[PDB]
Amino acid sequence: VYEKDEGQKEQLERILRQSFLFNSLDEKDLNTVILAMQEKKIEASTCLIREGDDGECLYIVQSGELNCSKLIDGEERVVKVVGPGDAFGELALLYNAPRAATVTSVSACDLWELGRDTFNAIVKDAATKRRSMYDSFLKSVHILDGMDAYERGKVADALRTEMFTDGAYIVRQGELGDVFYIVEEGSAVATKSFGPGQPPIEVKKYQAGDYFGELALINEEPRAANVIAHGICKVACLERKSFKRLMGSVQDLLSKKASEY
Ligand SMILES: Nc1ncnc2c1ncn2[C@@H]1O[C@@H]2COP(=O)(O)O[C@H]2[C@H]1O
Ligand SMILES: Nc1ncnc2c1ncn2[C@@H]1O[C@@H]2COP(=O)(O)O[C@H]2[C@H]1O
Fold first, then answer.
1. d(CA 158, ligand 2 centre) in Å
2. What is the atom index within ligand 1 of the atom nearest the CA of 98?
3. 236 and 184 in contact (C-beta within 8 Å)?
4. What is the spatial distance between Cα 188 and Cα 142, in angstroms, rounded to a whole number?
5. DSSP calls for 186-243
6. What CA–CA distances, in Å, run from 11 to 22, 212, 216, 219?
7. Which CATH class is domain 1-124?
8. Which residue among 27, 87, 143, 206 is buried most deeply as judged by most CB within 10 Å?
């Protein structure tokens, strides 16, 4: 029941590292969570979690789709579809509350289940601290100064962190771009080739609190420059879909500031 083969562990590690509540774990803590996780397969149209019940575990989806719904004014109202890579059933564990929605599979699903005790011991404090630290950080990132606390908190809830050592390319000129970056600590440099057959030249130096990688998202174009870690660089990362859905009018600010390049 805890036994997993190498293939299973590898796929589980990949999805866990990308999952918001687990993304801040060190590799050994993530390994301990992996040890604790139990596989759970369900057929389509299985009513897995029921609104109002006690919650003693959470799930992450390896494959399949499920609907989350709320019983409101006598009908089930679907409020979110979850699919591969998504975690669900975490709210009852994060906030010590009854299940806030019913979750039903739409297809056959392959899930991994984590118990409340392991979540409490290894994940819960780290996750809530990370969120708070993201909130603190964003309050000193000035392009977000126009947001209110709730807008900024939503962005904070969609951030992941990545570390890059000296010389590692965070983005490469001409590649597809689906991530917006803000430097949390360390440094980076942008270099840009101004035409075919021209080597790139340094065009900007980044420090903590600076952002980059917005142009591919706003303009729907390939990356316009390389961004390379200088010494070391720790970046907060916001995916394209979250950028578009959460940044609001900051997208307009970013668009207008593009003329400064
Ligand atoms: N809008 C929503 N409100 C509440 N729960 C939701 C929503 N969307 C998805 N869910 C998921 O449905 C789950 C129901 O169990 P939990 O309350 O433990 O955790 C909840 C979330 O993972
Ligand atoms: N002179 C410049 N031209 C274009 N992009 C730049 C320049 N200086 C820094 N950048 C950043 O480099 C990033 C490369 O990825 P993007 O095109 O998504 O967004 C770009 C900007 O954030």
1. 22
2. 17
3. yes
4. 19
5. EEEEEEE--STT---EEEEEE-TT-EE--HHHHHT---SSEEEEEEEEEEEEEEHHHH
6. 15, 30, 29, 33
7. mainly beta
8. 206
